[PDB]
Paper text:
The [name] family, with ZUP1 as its sole human member, has a modular architecture with a core catalytic domain highly active against the ubiquitin-derived peptide RLRGG, but not against ubiquitin itself.
Interestingly, this fungal protein preferentially cleaves K48-linked ubiquitin chains. The asymmetric unit contained two [name] molecules. [name] assumes a globular α/β papain-fold structure. The active site residues (Cys-42, His-165, and Asp-183) assume a geometry similar to other papain-fold cysteine proteases. As predicted by sequence analysis, all ubiquitin-binding domains of ZUP1 are absent from [name], and no additional UBD candidates are apparent from the structure.
Author numbering: 1 to 244
Amino acid sequence: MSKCLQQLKRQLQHFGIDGCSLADGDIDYFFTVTGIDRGWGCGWRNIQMLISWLQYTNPNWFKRNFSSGNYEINSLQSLLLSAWMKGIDAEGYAQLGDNLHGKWIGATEVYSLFTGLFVNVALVDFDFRSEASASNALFLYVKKHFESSNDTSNVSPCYLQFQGHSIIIIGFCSSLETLVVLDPDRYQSVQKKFVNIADFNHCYMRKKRSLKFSQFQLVHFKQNIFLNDFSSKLEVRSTRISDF
Ligand code: NA
């Protein structure tokens, strides 16, 4: 689904869901297919969505990195290996020699790949004893991330990781205190007409009670989106938010 922020804004207005702040620019939706890349493709599909956001917001960066406009998963395997070979992620050598096809990837690989593309990546680690506290801190940070009063084009989507699954956060809904998300493992519940608000919510909204995890990893791009060199970003350094 191409340019899915324009249509999603219309659906939010149609269902009367107020208080939504979404990422700037636009984004394409990428999804896994059951019996093909379902169960390991989610992280790769989420990287594809983040690439599409960069594509809409800086075409020059996109032309420079994807000369044929091709960022299929095979292109991403080259970029991930390239980042490891350039010294990004101190522990990246531990995955040299693996098959990159079929490989589950996480926030560290998301950081490594985009850092190798000279993208300025922020990584936030939510690590709590209390499950309620973890979602409280996460939801507040994400809510503040998407809040913007001035006309900007640098509010990026977020990659959210929990328990091996990952999704893209494209906004926050303050009337419901829910994440607005693009989940690559829920293609079956998108490719049809939404008539009831309940089906829309199950697809695009994540309440705190739907994310009963005590650990989250969050990746997004910074206000200064692009780097001149990643020599200072070789080590994966996250900011840790915790109650212990
Ligand atoms: Na803005």
